[PDB]
Write an enzyme that holds these catalytic residues in place. Structure first.
Site, short mmCIF file in Angstrom:
data_model
loop_
_atom_site.label_atom_id
_atom_site.label_comp_id
_atom_site.label_asym_id
_atom_site.label_seq_id
_atom_site.Cartn_x
_atom_site.Cartn_y
_atom_site.Cartn_z
N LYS A 1 -77.02 -65.77 -65.38
CA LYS A 1 -75.92 -64.82 -65.56
C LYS A 1 -76.58 -63.57 -66.12
O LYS A 1 -77.72 -63.61 -66.59
CB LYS A 1 -74.86 -65.34 -66.54
CG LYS A 1 -75.42 -65.81 -67.89
CD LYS A 1 -74.38 -66.50 -68.79
CE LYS A 1 -73.97 -67.89 -68.29
NZ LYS A 1 -72.54 -67.91 -67.82
N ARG A 2 -75.86 -62.45 -66.09
CA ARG A 2 -76.39 -61.21 -66.64
C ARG A 2 -76.80 -61.37 -68.10
O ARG A 2 -76.16 -62.12 -68.85
CB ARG A 2 -75.36 -60.08 -66.47
CG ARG A 2 -75.19 -59.62 -65.03
CD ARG A 2 -76.46 -58.97 -64.49
NE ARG A 2 -76.79 -57.74 -65.22
CZ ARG A 2 -76.50 -56.51 -64.80
NH1 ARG A 2 -75.87 -56.33 -63.64
NH2 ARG A 2 -76.83 -55.47 -65.54
N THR B 1 -67.47 -67.35 -63.71
CA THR B 1 -67.31 -67.94 -62.38
C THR B 1 -68.54 -68.77 -62.02
O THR B 1 -68.44 -69.73 -61.26
CB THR B 1 -67.06 -66.89 -61.28
OG1 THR B 1 -68.06 -65.87 -61.35
CG2 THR B 1 -65.67 -66.26 -61.43
N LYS C 1 -69.14 -72.63 -60.11
CA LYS C 1 -70.18 -72.91 -59.11
C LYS C 1 -71.02 -74.14 -59.48
O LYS C 1 -71.29 -75.00 -58.62
CB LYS C 1 -71.10 -71.69 -58.93
CG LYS C 1 -70.37 -70.39 -58.60
CD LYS C 1 -71.34 -69.22 -58.52
CE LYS C 1 -70.61 -67.88 -58.56
NZ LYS C 1 -71.58 -66.75 -58.72
N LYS D 1 -73.02 -63.40 -74.10
CA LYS D 1 -73.31 -64.61 -73.32
C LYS D 1 -74.32 -65.52 -74.04
O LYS D 1 -74.54 -66.67 -73.65
CB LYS D 1 -73.80 -64.24 -71.92
CG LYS D 1 -72.74 -63.57 -71.04
CD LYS D 1 -73.32 -63.13 -69.70
CE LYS D 1 -72.36 -62.25 -68.92
NZ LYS D 1 -71.28 -63.05 -68.25
N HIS E 1 -60.52 -57.69 -66.74
CA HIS E 1 -61.62 -58.64 -66.70
C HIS E 1 -62.38 -58.73 -68.02
O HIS E 1 -63.41 -59.38 -68.09
CB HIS E 1 -62.63 -58.25 -65.62
CG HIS E 1 -62.09 -58.28 -64.23
ND1 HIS E 1 -62.32 -59.33 -63.36
CD2 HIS E 1 -61.35 -57.38 -63.54
CE1 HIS E 1 -61.75 -59.07 -62.20
NE2 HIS E 1 -61.15 -57.89 -62.28
C1 LIG Z 1 -64.92 -54.55 -67.01
O1 LIG Z 1 -65.00 -55.97 -67.21
C2 LIG Z 1 -65.94 -56.58 -66.44
C3 LIG Z 1 -66.90 -55.86 -65.74
C4 LIG Z 1 -67.85 -56.53 -64.97
CL1 LIG Z 1 -69.04 -55.66 -64.09
C5 LIG Z 1 -67.83 -57.92 -64.88
O2 LIG Z 1 -68.77 -58.56 -64.11
C6 LIG Z 1 -66.87 -58.64 -65.58
C7 LIG Z 1 -66.84 -60.17 -65.47
O3 LIG Z 1 -65.83 -60.39 -64.44
C8 LIG Z 1 -65.76 -61.77 -64.02
C9 LIG Z 1 -64.71 -61.87 -62.89
O4 LIG Z 1 -63.39 -61.77 -63.44
C10 LIG Z 1 -65.44 -62.71 -65.20
O5 LIG Z 1 -65.61 -64.07 -64.77
C11 LIG Z 1 -66.35 -62.44 -66.42
O6 LIG Z 1 -65.85 -63.15 -67.55
C12 LIG Z 1 -66.41 -60.93 -66.73
O7 LIG Z 1 -67.30 -60.65 -67.82
C13 LIG Z 1 -65.92 -57.97 -66.36
#
Ligand SMILES: COc1cc(Cl)c(O)c([C@@H]2O[C@H](CO)[C@@H](O)[C@H](O)[C@H]2O)c1
Ligand SMILES: COc1cc(Cl)c(O)c([C@@H]2O[C@H](CO)[C@@H](O)[C@H](O)[C@H]2O)c1
Lengths: 810, 810
Positions: free
Chosen positions: A542-543, A650, A654, A548, A351
């Site tokens: 988003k976080r 994601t 949405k 970002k 991810h």
């Molecule tokens: C270890 O890599 C991570 C860890 C966490 Cl907690 C996370 O929310 C995502 C996010 O995971 C999402 C689901 O794949 C992606 O849409 C985002 O691009 C990505 O940043 C990736």
């Protein structure tokens, strides 16, 4: 009231009312005289839960009799949000419950707001697992989500003096009506100890034992009568634990701390022992449960035919050496056969490509905590590297690059390398991300085993993210094209034939306006903040993360403010700029960015010259339930990560589904979104991945941009001089220094194109008819981004199972 | 099957069956195919619980409308045992549920054994509170039990190698179907901080806050449709508690430790801070709840008319300064008025005269933990001592004796003195005990305020301790005299007219034999121990304590063994000697006594010459549920504490009600028991209190007894030489040394009379007809020892309320 919310028949409404009254009396032990809104919520939740159980029991009976291949989705995060409305939606109970509660003199929407979020995740990865569970149930797959029942989920964010404050998310305080404790299925998990070698193999002895107690939560499919299980483990000390007397009982807390709290880091690795214990705890308990269920159907040849294990990133990567441990040490299989089974069983989803987010565990930690697993990992590495050496003879650097063991001041295990070695499939989460994996960080592995590497573009469930959160839009769509699209989102393409339909254009715009009005009223009621509902709702939720680039948004906001102050009597399209998201408690820069946002708002929102032409609001405590409110209300979706950093996103999907236009870089799933909608219907700006690479080779010099862009210079001077912090002039010095001297994410490099692109957004918004027509073109092409599509691809291309839309008998 | 267990009507049985099936399906989420006996238990428990709730809601509604004076019973212990059968008994559901479960193909008695004891007490004091709750509900009093919901109750006792081992009593593991969490009634409790003095009084500031969350358990009266509440507080950390991030969440355990574990000491004071926190926690939360309920009916003059607070020993003694704190600091009443209210509200029951059991809290502990309470205590003391000085001018020693503050190396607060000063009534728990209080430890207080001092002889509930545990006996009694005696135990006197009734004599003896057979079978099934059911069942079950003199019993056992070995072919009445009870984990001598008992059994039970004429069995894990099994099976009840040490005893009463004869000293309630039955019908031996006093004045020399009694000398030589521990000859040296040189309880002094009295027991047992006739004379005169009598006396003489046997509408 509305069609998509199901039938409210006399028979159903009457029965729901009596079961509501029964639960209020017998379950809650209350009468109408002393009952509070919370009591009414629980009576409803218990009533709705009753409708699940029959389907839940017969689904699991069905799987026992048919014995399909089982899918085990292992994740440290399940960001579920609220369950009540989702359950009603999937069971076609929404209108019936609405009617029943109305006749009891209650407002169901008011009761819905009482439920706590199950906030057992940080952001996208945790929410993906939740969408996936929904889709797997909707597609009739024999799927189980396995995770940890954290006592405390993601912290509740308070804003005090413009700063983020954290408080414990005590989500279980009032109880969780959805879960069923299963203490009878409690399993032991082993920690520490040592390895003994006997005549008959290795033995892991002198261990500390922690019990894993499962709690089961039902996962209903969309109107197919399928109810799958999410099983979450809770840590329990054994009864002879440390057994002066009183202290020994009090020390039970030590073992039970494993499931106490979610590590609140999004896309960031924190190498703490407690986190490692959590990761092994979920893996060890889950694998025992898997093997137990497999035996209760000796011959492990058929194991991969009956079991698939999907690893949600490397967090459950210990499943690989744990499976080996069980098969070799306990079941007495030879190494090669056990390895064949393991590889065919496991698959790994990555991810992220951010170095700081990749799990690299110190050998000394694994040595003490999991001595047998380290030995197995070493053996895996040796045999893997022997294959590499045979394929690329003499390539000694490749050997060091591909090793699971990283040498240095502290030796570490690269968990991603372990996952690739031990899985038959490795996937990224968007086409560009999967390509980046093969070209960069996993290039060597791709060259050795090209067949392993796949793409599975992420998706979101159209149940929660359209029907549930935006019933108004779901209804106007259903009026035209029927209800089939809810479980076949590709059908939204039919809406392209309505892009010139004056009735539809008006209705789409009406739904948005209503959503904006509802959200504007939510803000005043719950947070006492005043907004103009006729302004463009410009949102980035988003976080909080440097990659970002909430900071790039901030720069644009200040640009708009400065331009207004320069020419006050010039017309500008009014905007409400909303930014929200949590910062990891230990992430200093992210906490500073939150303070910057509130600081900008403090100046902008109180300047009389600005009026209501520009407002900047920090959305407090962003979480699933808040996402469901703000996203339907958005006009403009900010998806502005530096190209090559956001694996998928994601949130972007949405917003697209809910009638917002997108301003974004060609990053993650944005690329595929623009491809589906057409680039003309997207606001694309900035460097592509290739441009970022070119700038890196040359060397990124932020001063160059400062020197050549007067508007950017003004902002930096404002930040430095204390314009946004008069009482603490040097408050944002860290931010300025980072921007000017050590910005990994090239905020300045995309500034000019971003600002120009934003001008084109405002221009289009001035023409409501053409804005809405572009919106329709987005909604109509959002079909690809249903998690039903994503899960169908996993099922066919990785798990080797066929999805089924067929109903189970009611 | 039997009359006293109620009616099993077609309508009730059918409805119970369907609700059982409903709970199994909806509540437990199981079907008959996967359900275990535990699942069946919970389905039954939930079904029976349903019958409580209607009565529970309408009882509490009734109290709201009628507004009677409320009784608050404050206790750190509620030794409740199992709840299922008790609820069925009190609701007249036993036969109906028996029938319903039988028709479902289930054995109800088997399901009953699955329930965990609520073991929230140590022994007699905790069990008294439980009997009291039962009686208060049966007598229609508006009564509330208030305590702590310990996560871990009294430890489970395992015997390993003859030694006591402790394990955590994780009684909530599978859940508690009886309790209802009430998180909405959560109250803050304050600790530490400091006192500020303002213009407008004292303020307690800078405190640490712990939340008190109530859990409510229904307490059904016997067939009167009254259901009262036991409210138990659980400790919760506030959400901003210590709010790096992870550690702050983990540190919540510190606050929640308050309600984690019951201090496992019976009749012994352990001055630990955690215990003090527990004591304040229960008091602070309870008093807020009391005042809230009182206001929801300004004028605190009527407070004592609407509220009574009964302090179960000094454990909740902080209620006195806490009430003062609230009335003075928060409600702004002047001292004198607040004191008047406090005194008229509070009453205190003492349960001990043992110096080591009396609570004396170090001033420095109270200073740090409860600074405002210490100030209030000092003020109480000053004003109290001014009254003493006025009543006894110049008596300076009286002033130091009566002070609440004890001077010395560490200054302490005498909590008993605080309780007497601040209560309108002080009572002992048996006539001899109450007299001892006035003559010894509270003599000065009695001289100052004679009106305060009362007696309330303890009792036991005839529901649990006859109907529930001995249905066979309850039935044969009901056949003769009807069912009225169950709530009017004095009616058992009618049985005196059956002492020469040959049918009744046979039936009484038959019931005992059946009970003995059932218990002999329980022992083989659960513990694999073989006993002779025709032997005299000689039992001593109670906490292991030096004053209770399990050691004297041991000496008799060894005497019997030695006499058999001396004359093997001489006939002796066969005995099964059963001793059971837990030792406090830190009580070394008590742990040694357990080892001695098992050691004696190891020799006695394996000597071929003895055969089955003598068996010695240690009853493992003695607790309420075990008491319910062994007591109906007993022939001989051992109540052999040194005169003046056992305040009352209640086990003694349980044995009397269930057809055992009693061998005992004239101590505690034994005196009144012998008085009721007639001394000819009791096996009384040993020193009276006056004889103990004479020996103390002279000086107790154990060597004298050793020198003059050859049989006693032999035993001591056996213990010393290693006869009962061949591999560790010096194992019992501590025991011998104590017996010979520092025996506070004069074991040797009562040895000769004890052994002779035991000979008279064996003689009577040889004549089954005359044994049984004496038994009948005991059962017939046990009426006084019903807790209904005890509670009626508290109600009339202390609380100022009238008991009511009238039914509430069903
Ligand atoms: C270890 O890599 C991570 C860890 C966490 Cl907690 C996370 O929310 C995502 C996010 O995971 C999402 C689901 O794949 C992606 O849409 C985002 O691009 C990505 O940043 C990736
Ligand atoms: C602080 O004094 C105590 C403490 C505890 Cl935990 C206890 O069980 C008893 C017992 O309390 C029982 C109930 O009054 C009496 O029958 C016994 O004689 C007495 O020893 C007295």
């Amino acid at each position: 009231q509305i069609s998509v919310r199901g039938l409210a028949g006399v028979e159903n409404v009457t029965e729901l009312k009596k079961n509501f009254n029964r639960h209020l009396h017998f379950t809650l032990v209350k009468d109408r005289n002393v009952a509070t809104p919370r009591d009414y919520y629980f009576a409803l939740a218990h009533t709705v839960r009753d409708h699940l159980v029959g389907r839940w029991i017969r689904t699991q009976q069905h799987y026992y009799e048919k014995d399909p291949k089982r899918i085990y989705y292992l994740s440290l995060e399940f960001y579920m949000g609220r369950t009540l409305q989702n359950t009603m939606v999937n069971l076609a109970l929404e209108n019936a419950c609405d009617e029943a509660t109305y006749q009891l003199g209650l407002d169901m929407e008011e009761l819905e707001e009482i439920e706590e979020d199950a906030g057992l995740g940080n952001g996208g990865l945790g929410r993906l697992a939740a969408c996936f569970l929904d889709s797997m149930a909707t597609l009739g797959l024999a799927a189980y989500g396995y995770g940890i029942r954290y006592e405390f989920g993601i912290f509740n964010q308070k804003i005090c003096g413009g700063w983020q404050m954290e408080e414990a998310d005590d989500w279980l305080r009032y109880g969780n009506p959805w879960e069923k404790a299963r203490p009878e299925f409690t399993l032991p998990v082993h920690f520490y100890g040592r390895v003994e070698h006997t005549s008959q193999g290795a033995k892991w002895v002198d261990t500390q034992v922690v019990l894993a107690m499962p709690y089961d939560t039902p996962v209903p499919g969309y109107r197919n009568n399928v109810v799958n299980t999410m099983r979450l483990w809770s840590a329990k000390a054994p009864n002879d634990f440390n057994l002066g007397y009183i202290q020994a009982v009090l020390d039970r807390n030590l073992a039970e701390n494993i499931s106490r709290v979610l590590y609140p880091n999004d896309n960031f690795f924190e190498g703490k022992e407690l986190r490692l214990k959590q990761e092994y705890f979920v893996v060890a308990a889950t694998l025992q449960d898997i093997i137990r269920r497999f035996k209760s159907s000796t011959n492990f040849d058929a194991f991969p035919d009956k079991v698939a294990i999907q690893l949600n990133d490397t967090h459950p990567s210990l499943a690989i050496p744990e499976l080996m441990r069980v098969l070799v040490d306990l079941e007495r299989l030879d190494w090669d056969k056990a390895w064949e089974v393991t590889v065919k069983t496991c698959a790994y989803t990555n991810h992220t490509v951010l170095p700081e987010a990749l799990e690299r565990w110190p050998v000394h930690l694994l040595e003490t905590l999991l001595p047998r697993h380290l030995q197995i990992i070493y053996e895996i590495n040796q045999r893997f590297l022997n294959r590499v050496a045979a394929a690329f003879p003499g390539d000694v650097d490749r050997l060091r690059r591909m090793s699971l063991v990283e040498e240095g001041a502290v030796k570490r295990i690269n968990m991603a390398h372990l996952c690739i070695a031990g899985s038959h499939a490795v996937n990224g989460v968007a086409r560009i991300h999967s390509e980046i994996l093969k070209k960069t960080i996993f290039k060597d592995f791709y060259e050795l085993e090209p067949h392993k590497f796949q793409n599975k573009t992420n998706g979101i469930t159209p149940r929660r993210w359209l029907v549930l959160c935006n019933p108004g839009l779901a209804e106007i769509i259903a009026e035209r094209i029927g209800e089939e699209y809810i479980s076949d989102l590709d059908q939204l393409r039919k809406l392209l034939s309505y892009v010139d339909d004056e009735a539809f254009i008006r209705d789409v715009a009406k739904v948005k306006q209503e959503n904006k009005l509802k959200f504007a009223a939510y803000l005043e009621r719950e947070y006492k903040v005043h907004i103009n509902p006729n302004s463009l709702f410009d949102v980035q939720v988003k976080r909080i993360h440097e990659y970002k680039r909430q900071l790039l948004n901030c720069l644009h906001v200040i640009t708009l403010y400065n331009r207004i102050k320069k020419e006050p009597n010039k017309f500008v399209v009014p905007r409400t700029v909303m930014i929200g998201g949590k910062a990891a408690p230990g992430y200093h820069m992210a906490k500073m960015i939150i303070k910057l946002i509130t600081a900008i708002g403090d100046v902008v929102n109180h300047d009389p010259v600005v009026g209501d032409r520009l407002r900047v609001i920090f959305l407090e405590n962003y979480r699933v339930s808040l996402a469901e409110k703000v996203i339907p209300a958005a006009d403009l979706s900010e998806q502005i990560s530096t190209a090559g950093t956001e694996a998928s996103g994601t949130g972007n999907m949405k917003f697209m589904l809910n009638g917002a236009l997108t301003i974004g870089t060609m990053d993650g799933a944005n690329v595929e979104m623009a491809e589906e909608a057409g680039e003309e219907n997207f606001f694309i700006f900035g460097m592509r991945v290739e441009d970022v690479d070119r700038l890196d080779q040359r060397g990124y010099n932020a001063q160059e941009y400062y020197d050549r862009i007067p508007e950017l210079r003004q902002i930096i001077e404002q930040l430095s001089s204390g314009f946004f912090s008069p009482k603490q002039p040097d408050l944002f010095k860290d931010i300025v220094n980072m921007l000017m001297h050590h910005d990994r994410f090239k905020v300045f490099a995309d500034y000019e194109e971003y600002v120009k692109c934003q001008e084109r957004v405002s221009a289009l918004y001035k023409n409501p008819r053409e804005w809405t027509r572009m919106v329709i073109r987005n909604i109509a092409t959002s079909g690809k981004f249903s998690s039903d599509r994503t899960i169908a691809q996993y099922a066919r291309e990785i798990w080797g199972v066929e999805p089924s839309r067929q109903r189970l008998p009611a």
